[PDB]
Design a protein around this nucleic acid. Structure first.
Ligand SMILES: [Mg+2]
Ligand SMILES: [Mg+2]
Ligand SMILES: [Mg+2]
Ligand SMILES: [Mg+2]
Ligand SMILES: [Mg+2]
Ligand SMILES: [Mg+2]
Ligand SMILES: [Mg+2]
Ligand SMILES: [Mg+2]
Ligand SMILES: [Mg+2]
Ligand SMILES: [Mg+2]
Ligand SMILES: [Mg+2]
Ligand SMILES: [Mg+2]
Ligand SMILES: [Mg+2]
Ligand SMILES: [Mg+2]
Ligand SMILES: [Mg+2]
Ligand SMILES: [Mg+2]
Ligand SMILES: [Mg+2]
Ligand SMILES: [Mg+2]
Ligand SMILES: [Mg+2]
Ligand SMILES: [Mg+2]
Ligand SMILES: [Mg+2]
Ligand SMILES: [Mg+2]
Ligand SMILES: [Mg+2]
Ligand SMILES: [Mg+2]
Ligand SMILES: [Mg+2]
Ligand SMILES: [Mg+2]
Ligand SMILES: [Mg+2]
Ligand SMILES: [Mg+2]
Ligand SMILES: [Mg+2]
Ligand SMILES: [Mg+2]
Ligand SMILES: [Mg+2]
Ligand SMILES: [Mg+2]
Ligand SMILES: [Mg+2]
Ligand SMILES: [Mg+2]
Ligand SMILES: [Mg+2]
Ligand SMILES: [Mg+2]
Ligand SMILES: [Mg+2]
Ligand SMILES: [Mg+2]
Ligand SMILES: [Mg+2]
Ligand SMILES: [Mg+2]
Ligand SMILES: [Mg+2]
Ligand SMILES: [Mg+2]
Ligand SMILES: [Mg+2]
Ligand SMILES: [Mg+2]
Ligand SMILES: [Mg+2]
Ligand SMILES: [Mg+2]
Ligand SMILES: [Mg+2]
Ligand SMILES: [Mg+2]
Ligand SMILES: [Mg+2]
Ligand SMILES: [Mg+2]
Ligand SMILES: [Mg+2]
Ligand SMILES: [Mg+2]
Ligand SMILES: [Mg+2]
Ligand SMILES: [Mg+2]
Ligand SMILES: [Mg+2]
Ligand SMILES: [Mg+2]
Ligand SMILES: [Mg+2]
Ligand SMILES: [Mg+2]
Ligand SMILES: [Mg+2]
Ligand SMILES: [Mg+2]
Ligand SMILES: [Mg+2]
Ligand SMILES: [Mg+2]
Ligand SMILES: [Mg+2]
Ligand SMILES: [Mg+2]
Ligand SMILES: [Mg+2]
Ligand SMILES: [Mg+2]
Ligand SMILES: [Mg+2]
Ligand SMILES: [Mg+2]
Ligand SMILES: [Mg+2]
Ligand SMILES: [Mg+2]
Ligand SMILES: [Mg+2]
Ligand SMILES: [Mg+2]
Ligand SMILES: [Mg+2]
Ligand SMILES: [Mg+2]
Ligand SMILES: [Mg+2]
Ligand SMILES: [Mg+2]
Ligand SMILES: [Mg+2]
Ligand SMILES: [Mg+2]
Ligand SMILES: [Mg+2]
Ligand SMILES: [Mg+2]
Ligand SMILES: [Mg+2]
Ligand SMILES: [Mg+2]
Ligand SMILES: [Mg+2]
Ligand SMILES: [Mg+2]
Ligand SMILES: [Mg+2]
Ligand SMILES: [Mg+2]
Ligand SMILES: [Mg+2]
Ligand SMILES: [Mg+2]
Ligand SMILES: [Mg+2]
Ligand SMILES: [Mg+2]
Ligand SMILES: [Mg+2]
Ligand SMILES: [Mg+2]
Ligand SMILES: [Mg+2]
Ligand SMILES: [Mg+2]
Ligand SMILES: [Mg+2]
Ligand SMILES: [Mg+2]
Ligand SMILES: [Mg+2]
Ligand SMILES: [Mg+2]
Ligand SMILES: [Mg+2]
Ligand SMILES: [Mg+2]
Ligand SMILES: [Mg+2]
Ligand SMILES: [Mg+2]
Ligand SMILES: [Mg+2]
Ligand SMILES: [Mg+2]
Ligand SMILES: [Mg+2]
Ligand SMILES: [Mg+2]
Ligand SMILES: [Mg+2]
Ligand SMILES: [Mg+2]
Ligand SMILES: [Mg+2]
Ligand SMILES: [Mg+2]
Ligand SMILES: [Mg+2]
Ligand SMILES: [Mg+2]
Ligand SMILES: [Mg+2]
Ligand SMILES: [Mg+2]
Ligand SMILES: [Mg+2]
Ligand SMILES: [Mg+2]
Ligand SMILES: [Mg+2]
Ligand SMILES: [Mg+2]
Ligand SMILES: [Mg+2]
Ligand SMILES: [Mg+2]
Ligand SMILES: [Mg+2]
Ligand SMILES: [Mg+2]
Ligand SMILES: [Mg+2]
Ligand SMILES: [Mg+2]
Ligand SMILES: [Mg+2]
Ligand SMILES: [Mg+2]
Ligand SMILES: [Mg+2]
Ligand SMILES: [Mg+2]
Ligand SMILES: [Mg+2]
Ligand SMILES: [Mg+2]
Ligand SMILES: [Mg+2]
Ligand SMILES: [Mg+2]
Ligand SMILES: [Mg+2]
Ligand SMILES: [Mg+2]
Ligand SMILES: [Mg+2]
Ligand SMILES: [Mg+2]
Ligand SMILES: [Mg+2]
Ligand SMILES: [Mg+2]
Ligand SMILES: [Mg+2]
Ligand SMILES: [Mg+2]
Ligand SMILES: [Mg+2]
Ligand SMILES: [Mg+2]
Ligand SMILES: [Mg+2]
Ligand SMILES: [Mg+2]
Ligand SMILES: [Mg+2]
Ligand SMILES: [Mg+2]
Ligand SMILES: [Mg+2]
Ligand SMILES: [Mg+2]
Ligand SMILES: [Mg+2]
Ligand SMILES: [Mg+2]
Ligand SMILES: [Mg+2]
Ligand SMILES: [Mg+2]
Ligand SMILES: [Mg+2]
Ligand SMILES: [Mg+2]
Ligand SMILES: [Mg+2]
Ligand SMILES: [Mg+2]
Ligand SMILES: [Mg+2]
Ligand SMILES: [Mg+2]
Ligand SMILES: [Mg+2]
Ligand SMILES: [Mg+2]
Ligand SMILES: [Mg+2]
Ligand SMILES: [Mg+2]
Ligand SMILES: [Mg+2]
Ligand SMILES: [Mg+2]
Ligand SMILES: [Mg+2]
Ligand SMILES: [Mg+2]
Ligand SMILES: [Mg+2]
Ligand SMILES: [Mg+2]
Ligand SMILES: [Mg+2]
Ligand SMILES: [Mg+2]
Ligand SMILES: [Mg+2]
Ligand SMILES: [Mg+2]
Ligand SMILES: [Mg+2]
Ligand SMILES: [Mg+2]
Ligand SMILES: [Mg+2]
Ligand SMILES: [Mg+2]
Ligand SMILES: [Mg+2]
Ligand SMILES: [Mg+2]
Ligand SMILES: [Mg+2]
Ligand SMILES: [Mg+2]
Ligand SMILES: [Mg+2]
Ligand SMILES: [Mg+2]
Ligand SMILES: [Mg+2]
Ligand SMILES: [Mg+2]
Ligand SMILES: [Mg+2]
Ligand SMILES: [Mg+2]
Ligand SMILES: [Mg+2]
Ligand SMILES: [Mg+2]
Ligand SMILES: [Mg+2]
Ligand SMILES: [Mg+2]
Ligand SMILES: [Mg+2]
Ligand SMILES: [Mg+2]
Ligand SMILES: [Mg+2]
Ligand SMILES: [Mg+2]
Ligand SMILES: [Mg+2]
Ligand SMILES: [Mg+2]
Ligand SMILES: [Mg+2]
Ligand SMILES: [Mg+2]
Ligand SMILES: [Mg+2]
Ligand SMILES: [Mg+2]
Ligand SMILES: [Mg+2]
Ligand SMILES: [Mg+2]
Ligand SMILES: [Mg+2]
Ligand SMILES: [Mg+2]
Ligand SMILES: [Mg+2]
Ligand SMILES: [Mg+2]
Ligand SMILES: [Mg+2]
Ligand SMILES: [Mg+2]
Ligand SMILES: [Mg+2]
Ligand SMILES: [Mg+2]
Ligand SMILES: [Mg+2]
Ligand SMILES: [Mg+2]
Ligand SMILES: [Mg+2]
Ligand SMILES: [Mg+2]
Ligand SMILES: [Mg+2]
Ligand SMILES: [Mg+2]
Ligand SMILES: [Mg+2]
Ligand SMILES: [Mg+2]
Ligand SMILES: [Mg+2]
Ligand SMILES: [Mg+2]
Ligand SMILES: [Mg+2]
Ligand SMILES: [Mg+2]
Ligand SMILES: [Mg+2]
Ligand SMILES: [Mg+2]
Ligand SMILES: [Mg+2]
Ligand SMILES: [Mg+2]
Ligand SMILES: [Mg+2]
Ligand SMILES: [Zn+2]
Lengths: 53, 64
RNA sequence: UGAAAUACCACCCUGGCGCGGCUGGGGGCCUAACCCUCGGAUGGGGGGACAGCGCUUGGCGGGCAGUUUGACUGGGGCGGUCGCCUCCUAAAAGGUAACGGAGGCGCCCAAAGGUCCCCUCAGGCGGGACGGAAAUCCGCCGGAGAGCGCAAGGGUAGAAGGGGGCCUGACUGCGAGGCCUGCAAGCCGAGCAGGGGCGAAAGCCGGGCCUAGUGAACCGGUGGUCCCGUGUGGAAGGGCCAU
RNA sequence: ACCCGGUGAAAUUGAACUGGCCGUGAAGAUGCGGCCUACCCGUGGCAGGACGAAAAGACCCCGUGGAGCUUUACUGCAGCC
RNA sequence: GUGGAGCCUGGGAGUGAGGGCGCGAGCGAUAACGUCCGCGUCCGAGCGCGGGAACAACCGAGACCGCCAGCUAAGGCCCCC
RNA sequence: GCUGGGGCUAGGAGUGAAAAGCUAACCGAGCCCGGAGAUAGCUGGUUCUCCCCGAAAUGACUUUAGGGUCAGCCUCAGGCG
RNA sequence: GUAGGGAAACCGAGUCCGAACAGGGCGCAGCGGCCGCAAAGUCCGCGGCCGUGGACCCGAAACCGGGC
RNA sequence: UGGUUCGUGGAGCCAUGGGGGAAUCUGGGCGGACCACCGCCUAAGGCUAAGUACUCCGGGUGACCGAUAGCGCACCAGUAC
RNA sequence: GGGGGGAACCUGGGGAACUGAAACAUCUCAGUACCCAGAGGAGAGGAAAGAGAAAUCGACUCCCUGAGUAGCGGCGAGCGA
């Protein structure tokens, strides 16, 4: 991690809970991450979005 | 004068039915973003303190 | 007639004016609080609502107070060093010191991750416009000396290397059994369940060929949960999960 | 200072029946080995040795010991604004 | 393989300055009664005994007590002996 | 200038023609009593007898290094066998 | 002491995590002939060690109070 | 600001140095910020035995001392010095 | 009527430090030591503007217990209703 390589949380888009922490490079990957993840709240995979740590 | 219960021990540790000493796994207070899920999960359990260390803690808890 | 239309009475705005209340800031003056002073004192004179003094605000402050000012070390200081990785020393299991010999780390990658499919190197000789020792092309030889983000080592083409397609398993709930080990840590992990990815399938996938890329607890932040809530319902504040 | 009469201390002192050499030994031995030397006991003297005496090294280092002092060390207080 | 062997639970420690020697290395100078590791030993705690002139750790050997008995070990057998 | 008598100023205080001088024969902070049996991870000392066993001077960590905690190594009791 | 598990609400020979009837953590289960015997546990004594006290004894240099 | 277990904490309560500043039962304080409800209690005047502390003094009693002990003092001692 | 004395005890007004925290500042030691005032044979407190969950209790003081609980705490050492 660095000023450019940041930590971020992934929020389930259906129930709004942050379910995963991970990291990315914001120079290489400026758009907010969107990833399908398993939401344990929703009990199903859900598109999760990068939301600020 | 009577012994006093050590309050840091009472707050961190429990003596089980058979007198083992139990405490929360250390290591997920923070810096967790790069820890695997196997890691965070496993650190979420209680463990049983090593005998000589538990034996010491047990003596600080004279009235449990 | 425009959005709304005209005479006339209201309730209220835009801005401004003069009276007033109530006030904040400055300027002047006053005297009687308060201070000084005067043979004389229920008074005179001077300063004057300042100064002083109370409470409170922020500052300056070795004048003074309490202290702190690391360890290793062929004495101490000076210099150097302190955690982590790789090799050697290391006496063919493991481990093994010295201010012994050499180097690295404190990152990174949204692909540099998963899976399916396909492909194979460096180098040498020969041939080929610009074109060279080395750009790209053709032939032969060439088991790996190349590659594998970075140090070294181990590994490795019967791929871990190179290319593409679809993807997010860089899972959630766990976890038999072990490696290592004074503790606490660190490490590996089959399997089951949930919901997925790739594949016709067998199956693989709980990040990365591997070993560095890190930091216990305390205090606190944020999202969630809806567990406690000081007679009661809430609320304050906490717990719990995540960070 | 010395001798005789008078009075009469001190530090120090494990005990002592307390020699030299060459060696040895915790590395400088009267005390150990081998040798050499040496009858018993004093008095006046000398200071090489008894690592002589005195003083639990003052230098040096160590102790998460002290204290005086300094400052743009930390933190506070007086005082002043 | 029955040993002051081993394993398990518990009570009590002390130690956490080591040292010489042999062998294997590093450091040092193919120096040190040097230094730092490894395997082993001994002294430590066997400054008890024999040998090594004397001498913690070299050789011999693990001292329960007594004997004016015997055999040996290293080392010795000309005199000191 | 020296000096008698009578006075005043003191402990983070006095006093000082300044030496950290002097303040009742040791002043970089007087003496007495008290807190007080301060604290001392240091040095020293630790008292009858017999009998059995019998270490360590290492590893990890440590404002740690001549101190500790855990472990290793000793000992006792019970169990196992 | 006779119940534990859980941060807690709370449930209870279980309970906690969990969607789980999964897996796991932590837990739950005398001898002889109704008799006696033993025992959880607990009380008292004794001993070892530990904590708190000056805590095995002696020793600072210093610090602070009030006085002289 | 102090007191309380409460070290600023969600910090109430009791007390009060500063500022502001009421009401008389339809008044007021309290039940841990706050609000409601439900309760408890009546501030800003005073006194009040006993049960409690102590031991200069008197007495009783010791698995207390016995002249280096026991009080500093058995004695003409808070004396001599 | 006061004044001054009285060994401890008592209330009130002031109030340290060593030390502990294996350094230290908050914290601790401790509202202790000590100074001061005041009482008295005791002193203090005392007749709810209490407690705090019981639809309860019923001044105060003192002992046992509640309880090293609740809590407080560089959530350290410790402190402790
Ligand atoms: Mg944690
Ligand atoms: Mg932490
Ligand atoms: Mg957390
Ligand atoms: Mg947190
Ligand atoms: Mg990773
Ligand atoms: Mg890690
Ligand atoms: Mg993972
Ligand atoms: Mg994760
Ligand atoms: Mg209890
Ligand atoms: Mg219990
Ligand atoms: Mg004027
Ligand atoms: Mg005037
Ligand atoms: Mg005037
Ligand atoms: Mg004027
Ligand atoms: Mg003014
Ligand atoms: Mg005035
Ligand atoms: Mg103000
Ligand atoms: Mg101020
Ligand atoms: Mg200073
Ligand atoms: Mg300053
Ligand atoms: Mg101090
Ligand atoms: Mg410092
Ligand atoms: Mg420091
Ligand atoms: Mg200093
Ligand atoms: Mg330091
Ligand atoms: Mg040093
Ligand atoms: Mg040097
Ligand atoms: Mg050293
Ligand atoms: Mg050295
Ligand atoms: Mg040297
Ligand atoms: Mg040396
Ligand atoms: Mg230096
Ligand atoms: Mg070095
Ligand atoms: Mg590190
Ligand atoms: Mg090796
Ligand atoms: Mg090797
Ligand atoms: Mg090896
Ligand atoms: Mg080997
Ligand atoms: Mg091993
Ligand atoms: Mg690709
Ligand atoms: Mg790859
Ligand atoms: Mg791919
Ligand atoms: Mg080629
Ligand atoms: Mg060519
Ligand atoms: Mg050409
Ligand atoms: Mg070419
Ligand atoms: Mg290669
Ligand atoms: Mg590189
Ligand atoms: Mg698809
Ligand atoms: Mg396991
Ligand atoms: Mg382990
Ligand atoms: Mg599948
Ligand atoms: Mg599946
Ligand atoms: Mg398919
Ligand atoms: Mg798997
Ligand atoms: Mg990679
Ligand atoms: Mg990597
Ligand atoms: Mg802390
Ligand atoms: Mg800390
Ligand atoms: Mg917290
Ligand atoms: Mg409530
Ligand atoms: Mg609720
Ligand atoms: Mg309430
Ligand atoms: Mg309501
Ligand atoms: Mg409710
Ligand atoms: Mg609401
Ligand atoms: Mg909340
Ligand atoms: Mg919450
Ligand atoms: Mg958590
Ligand atoms: Mg979880
Ligand atoms: Mg004569
Ligand atoms: Mg004469
Ligand atoms: Mg003699
Ligand atoms: Mg003689
Ligand atoms: Mg010699
Ligand atoms: Mg000699
Ligand atoms: Mg002689
Ligand atoms: Mg002799
Ligand atoms: Mg001789
Ligand atoms: Mg002789
Ligand atoms: Mg001779
Ligand atoms: Mg003579
Ligand atoms: Mg002489
Ligand atoms: Mg001389
Ligand atoms: Mg001599
Ligand atoms: Mg001499
Ligand atoms: Mg001398
Ligand atoms: Mg001497
Ligand atoms: Mg001394
Ligand atoms: Mg000395
Ligand atoms: Mg010295
Ligand atoms: Mg000096
Ligand atoms: Mg020195
Ligand atoms: Mg020093
Ligand atoms: Mg230090
Ligand atoms: Mg130290
Ligand atoms: Mg110091
Ligand atoms: Mg000092
Ligand atoms: Mg001035
Ligand atoms: Mg046996
Ligand atoms: Mg044995
Ligand atoms: Mg043994
Ligand atoms: Mg044992
Ligand atoms: Mg014992
Ligand atoms: Mg020890
Ligand atoms: Mg020791
Ligand atoms: Mg040590
Ligand atoms: Mg040594
Ligand atoms: Mg050694
Ligand atoms: Mg040894
Ligand atoms: Mg050594
Ligand atoms: Mg050796
Ligand atoms: Mg040989
Ligand atoms: Mg050698
Ligand atoms: Mg070597
Ligand atoms: Mg040479
Ligand atoms: Mg020798
Ligand atoms: Mg040596
Ligand atoms: Mg040598
Ligand atoms: Mg050598
Ligand atoms: Mg050896
Ligand atoms: Mg010794
Ligand atoms: Mg021997
Ligand atoms: Mg031996
Ligand atoms: Mg011997
Ligand atoms: Mg001998
Ligand atoms: Mg002997
Ligand atoms: Mg011998
Ligand atoms: Mg001999
Ligand atoms: Mg002989
Ligand atoms: Mg006979
Ligand atoms: Mg024979
Ligand atoms: Mg022979
Ligand atoms: Mg011979
Ligand atoms: Mg002869
Ligand atoms: Mg005069
Ligand atoms: Mg005079
Ligand atoms: Mg005079
Ligand atoms: Mg004066
Ligand atoms: Mg004076
Ligand atoms: Mg005075
Ligand atoms: Mg002073
Ligand atoms: Mg000063
Ligand atoms: Mg002073
Ligand atoms: Mg002065
Ligand atoms: Mg003068
Ligand atoms: Mg000077
Ligand atoms: Mg005097
Ligand atoms: Mg003088
Ligand atoms: Mg001083
Ligand atoms: Mg004097
Ligand atoms: Mg006094
Ligand atoms: Mg004290
Ligand atoms: Mg003491
Ligand atoms: Mg000290
Ligand atoms: Mg003793
Ligand atoms: Mg033996
Ligand atoms: Mg050592
Ligand atoms: Mg060691
Ligand atoms: Mg380590
Ligand atoms: Mg450690
Ligand atoms: Mg030490
Ligand atoms: Mg131990
Ligand atoms: Mg053994
Ligand atoms: Mg046995
Ligand atoms: Mg279960
Ligand atoms: Mg089970
Ligand atoms: Mg019993
Ligand atoms: Mg113990
Ligand atoms: Mg005490
Ligand atoms: Mg004691
Ligand atoms: Mg003791
Ligand atoms: Mg003392
Ligand atoms: Mg002094
Ligand atoms: Mg001081
Ligand atoms: Mg001072
Ligand atoms: Mg004083
Ligand atoms: Mg004074
Ligand atoms: Mg207030
Ligand atoms: Mg307070
Ligand atoms: Mg708090
Ligand atoms: Mg409060
Ligand atoms: Mg007031
Ligand atoms: Mg009312
Ligand atoms: Mg009202
Ligand atoms: Mg009130
Ligand atoms: Mg109020
Ligand atoms: Mg209220
Ligand atoms: Mg109430
Ligand atoms: Mg009430
Ligand atoms: Mg009264
Ligand atoms: Mg009565
Ligand atoms: Mg009474
Ligand atoms: Mg009485
Ligand atoms: Mg009497
Ligand atoms: Mg008698
Ligand atoms: Mg007598
Ligand atoms: Mg006497
Ligand atoms: Mg007598
Ligand atoms: Mg008497
Ligand atoms: Mg007497
Ligand atoms: Mg007399
Ligand atoms: Mg009076
Ligand atoms: Mg009176
Ligand atoms: Mg008071
Ligand atoms: Mg007063
Ligand atoms: Mg006070
Ligand atoms: Mg007082
Ligand atoms: Mg003061
Ligand atoms: Mg202090
Ligand atoms: Mg003390
Ligand atoms: Mg302590
Ligand atoms: Mg301290
Ligand atoms: Mg200390
Ligand atoms: Mg210091
Ligand atoms: Mg302190
Ligand atoms: Mg203390
Ligand atoms: Mg206090
Ligand atoms: Mg007293
Ligand atoms: Mg009086
Ligand atoms: Mg009475
Ligand atoms: Mg009374
Ligand atoms: Mg009264
Ligand atoms: Mg009344
Ligand atoms: Mg209880
Ligand atoms: Mg704590
Ligand atoms: Mg207190
Ligand atoms: Zn969701």
């Amino acid at each position: 991690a660095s000023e450019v390589r940041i930590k971020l949380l992934l929020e389930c888009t259906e129930c709004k809970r942050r379910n995963y922490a991970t990291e990315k490079n914001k120079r290489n990957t400026p758009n907010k991450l969107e990833l399908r993840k398993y939401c344990p709240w929703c009990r199903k995979h859900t598109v999760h979005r990068e939301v600020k740590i | 004068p009577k012994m006093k219960t050590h309050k840091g021990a009472k707050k961190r540790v429990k003596i089980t039915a058979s007198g083992k000493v139990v405490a929360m796994k250390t290591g997920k207070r923070h810096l967790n973003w790069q820890k695997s899920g196997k890691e965070i999960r496993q650190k979420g359990r209680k463990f049983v303190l090593a005998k000589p260390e538990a034996e010491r803690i047990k003596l600080l808890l004279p009235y449990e």
